[PDB]
Swiss-Prot record, chain A:
Residues 107-117 have a biased composition (Basic residues). Residues 104-122 are annotated as: Disordered. Keywords: Methylation, Ribonucleoprotein, Ribosomal protein, RNA-binding, rRNA-binding, tRNA-binding. NCBIfam families: rpsL_bact (TIGR00981). It comes from Mycolicibacterium smegmatis (strain ATCC 700084 / mc(2)155). With S4 and S5 plays an important role in translational accuracy. It comes from the Bacteria. This is Small ribosomal subunit protein uS12. The modification 3-methylthioaspartic acid is found at residue 88. GO terms for biological process: translation. One of its GO terms (molecular function) is structural constituent of ribosome. The lineage of its organism: Bacteria, Bacillati, Actinomycetota, Actinomycetes, Mycobacteriales. GO terms for cellular component: small ribosomal subunit. It holds the Pfam family Ribosom_S12_S23. The keyword RNA-binding applies.
Curated annotation (Swiss-Prot), chain B:
Keywords: Ribonucleoprotein, Ribosomal protein, RNA-binding, rRNA-binding. Coiled coil: none annotated. Pfam families: Ribosomal_S8 (PF00410). InterPro entries: Ribosomal_uS8, Ribosomal_uS8_CS, Ribosomal_uS8_sf. One of its GO terms (molecular function) is structural constituent of ribosome. Gene3D superfamilies: 3.30.1370.30, 3.30.1490.10. Belongs to the universal ribosomal protein uS8 family. This is Small ribosomal subunit protein uS8. It comes from Mycolicibacterium smegmatis (strain ATCC 700084 / mc(2)155). GO terms for biological process: translation. One of its GO terms (cellular component) is ribonucleoprotein complex. One of the primary rRNA binding proteins, it binds directly to 16S rRNA central domain where it helps coordinate assembly of the platform of the 30S subunit. Part of the 30S ribosomal subunit. Contacts proteins S5 and S12.
From Swiss-Prot, chain C:
It comes from Mycolicibacterium smegmatis (strain ATCC 700084 / mc(2)155). SMART domains: Ribosomal_S15 (SM01387). It comes from the Bacteria. HAMAP family: Ribosomal_uS15_B. GO terms for cellular component: cytosolic small ribosomal subunit. Pfam families: Ribosomal_S15. NCBIfam families: S15_bact (TIGR00952). One of the primary rRNA binding proteins, it binds directly to 16S rRNA where it helps nucleate assembly of the platform of the 30S subunit by binding and bridging several RNA helices of the 16S rRNA. Gene3D superfamilies: 6.10.250.3130, S15/NS1, RNA-binding. Belongs to the universal ribosomal protein uS15 family. GO terms for molecular function: rRNA binding; structural constituent of ribosome. This is Small ribosomal subunit protein uS15. The gene is rpsO.
RNA sequence: AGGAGGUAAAAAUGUUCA
RNA sequence: UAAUACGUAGGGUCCGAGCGUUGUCCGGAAUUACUGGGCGUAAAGAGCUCGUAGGUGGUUUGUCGCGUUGUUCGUGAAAACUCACAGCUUAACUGUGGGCGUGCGGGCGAUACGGGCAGACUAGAGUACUGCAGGGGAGACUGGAAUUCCUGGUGUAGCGGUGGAAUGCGCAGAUAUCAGGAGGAACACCGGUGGCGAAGGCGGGUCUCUGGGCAGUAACUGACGCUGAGGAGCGAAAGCGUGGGGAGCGAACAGGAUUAGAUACCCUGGUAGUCCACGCCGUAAACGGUGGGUACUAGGUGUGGGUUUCCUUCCUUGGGAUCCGUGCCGUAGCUA
RNA sequence: GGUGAUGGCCUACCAAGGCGACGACGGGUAGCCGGCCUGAGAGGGUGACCGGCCACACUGGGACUGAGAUACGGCCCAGACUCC
């Protein structure tokens, strides 16, 4: 455009979409699992992916994936929720992280123990 | 309508240099004549005549080509346009083509290249880059 | 659509000298006559939009010329508009 | 080379990854 | 079921008292492009004009020195950052000195450019004169063909319609044919890669009123120009209102047919509507899917309007030059 | 009149003006800056420590004292809360 078009109307950057709004600026949140359950992923994939509807401290109820092989989670469990995209599960953007005072580490993890809350055994 | 005969002059030059014309006739202005003088001195054209037209005066630029029709000019670029006038201080003058070019600068010491302007310690309106 | 006689009549008393046509005073006078005639024509033939556009064009030309006169010398502008019956 | 107009009525759809 | 992408082992790699993850910001993103993008088809030209504010400004003389530029002074706290040095054993860190402090204000200069002021000029723009072309527009009147209907003769049994039929019209005299009449709408041929118009769009003829354009003359004014946010106006068709009109066509609707079904294509009819008057609406593939103005950049070929000129038949749409248009082709250049 | 001081700061009267598309008035958000982070730079984001300015001190209002007051650890009132 012309310079006068710019000094009049100016450039406005496209608005970046706020993401993980349920955290409300926090890196993590605490929440009660209101409903632990399992979901079916998109068409190319098929599995029984473990999730929980969690009511965070931000007064927001969101779905959250439960990575790792096993999980001891029932309702009314205090859980720590981080961000992280799960592609095959469409309507989910949050994950649950072990070491939440309920979610103990995964059993027999021995490579990536930090990502699954597993203590070193020695 | 016409809004900068400087750009008109540069464009007549560029298009004639692209079409390998030997002459470029256009209307006359003292500023365009001084610009043509700068281009002549820096060797981007062969010569320039100021003659009389039916009404006013005309500039006839005799352009320059090598033996194998090498264009003596490779580019012209108006910079201080109407709508956006650009002015250069003596320190932040522009180096055209890493210095192998020539920037026309209008100053109160007259019309003089960026080299001359940095020598004389002055700056002003950057009319063109004529590498 | 003015005739040469009507034009020369107008130019006599709105032109500066004998052979002036291009003056703003003369042009504004001619355009004012044309605007009167065309306005009456349209008061009859209201749905002649193609001529009303020409009217709008003449109005704009007249406004431009009067703007030039008021820019140059305001007494000429005032004498012109009061002698033609104009508002501005 | 120069020089009017035509007719086929309707007749659908396609689990899987590919 | 033969996973270097899952899990584990080995082994390797990247870091290392850290390593990873999440969150937030910048980058990459020339992905809001001032530096540094674009809009024919990718998202992107308003439907088109008029015109306000604004932005922008042909040639030229002089001046102001506002912008601009040079120089100087003051300020731009310290810290920071940066350069150099020095010191904590090194480093981090710390200090010292300079630079930076991307600027602002005063002073003193320069005046090319922009701008202001005062002028001048005619190459833009506009006016005048002469001519020219044109479905440009509006109003009024009016013409013939054809359809339909009515009336009357002739005339008899089918007509109509389709892919093929059937609804239907007829046998109460249809179709067809002849004559006459009524009425409505549209205007064959001319009529086209043609003309005019800002676009929409404009085609029977005549009259009236009216707008725009082009060429030439160079008599005039003397940059008065260009664009134009918003705004205003115009704005196909459909539609709406009111009042007329209503032949044909014809959404809807109704039958018939086809069809598995057919709320459709086809047929038979047929209402609004199409038409007129005044007004609303304000959209369209309103498309060149290309905003306007200006200058320049190879040519060829058609065609429309006008000016001139040269062979001269001194016939002459014989040709050339030039202005304005409108098409086809084709360079350079541009383009995915 | 008032102030330390200019001023609708306040008041009587007088005039009817003033601001707005160059965005008034409103709505939302937010302490500002040196600086910090990023970035080739322009720019974008940020306003932590450190340093400067502002504002506030339970909420709201008010003055007094004084050279000087948003008077945190001062006063008066009202309100909420806590306590005797």
């Amino acid at each position: 455009p012309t310079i006068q078009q710019l000094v009049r109307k100016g450039r406005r950057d496209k608005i970046a979409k706020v993401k993980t709004a349920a955290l409300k600026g926090s890196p993590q949140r605490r929440g009660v699992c209101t409903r632990v359950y399992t979901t079916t992923p998109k068409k190319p994939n098929s599995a029984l992916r473990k999730v929980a509807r969690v009511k965070l401290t931000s007064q927001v109820e969101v779905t959250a994936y439960i990575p790792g092989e096993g999980h001891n989670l029932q309702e009314h469990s205090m859980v720590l929720v981080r961000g992280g995209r799960v592609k095959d599960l469409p309507g989910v953007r949050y994950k649950i992280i072990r070491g939440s005072l309920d979610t103990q580490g995964v059993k027999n993890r021995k490579q990536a123990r930090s990502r699954y809350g597993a203590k070193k055994e020695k | 309508t016409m809004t900068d005969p400087i750009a008109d002059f540069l464009t007549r030059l560029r298009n004639a240099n692209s079409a390998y014309h030997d002459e470029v006739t256009l209307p006359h202005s003292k500023l365009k004549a001084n610009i043509a003088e700068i281009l002549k001195r820096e060797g981007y054209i062969s010569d320039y005549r100021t003659e009389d037209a039916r009404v006013g005066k005309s500039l006839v630029v005799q352009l320059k080509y090598g033996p194998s029709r090498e264009r003596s000019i490779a580019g012209l670029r108006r910079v201080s346009k109407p709508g956006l006038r650009v002015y250069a201080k003596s320190t932040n003058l522009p180096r055209v083509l890493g210095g192998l070019g020539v920037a026309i600068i209008s100053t109160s010491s007259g019309l003089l290249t960026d080299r001359q302007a940095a020598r004389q310690g002055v700056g002003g309106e950057v009319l063109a880059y004529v590498w | 659509a003015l005739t040469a006689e009507q034009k020369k009549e107008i130019l006599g008393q709105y032109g500066l000298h004998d052979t002036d046509t291009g003056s703003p005073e003369a042009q504004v006078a001619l355009l004012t006559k044309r605007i009167q005639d065309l306005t009456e024509h349209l008061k009859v033939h209201k749905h002649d939009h193609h001529s009303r556009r020409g009217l709008l064009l003449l109005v704009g030309r007249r406004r431009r010329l009067l703007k030039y006169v008021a820019q140059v010398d305001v007494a000429r502008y005032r004498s012109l508009i009061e002698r033609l019956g104009l508002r501005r």
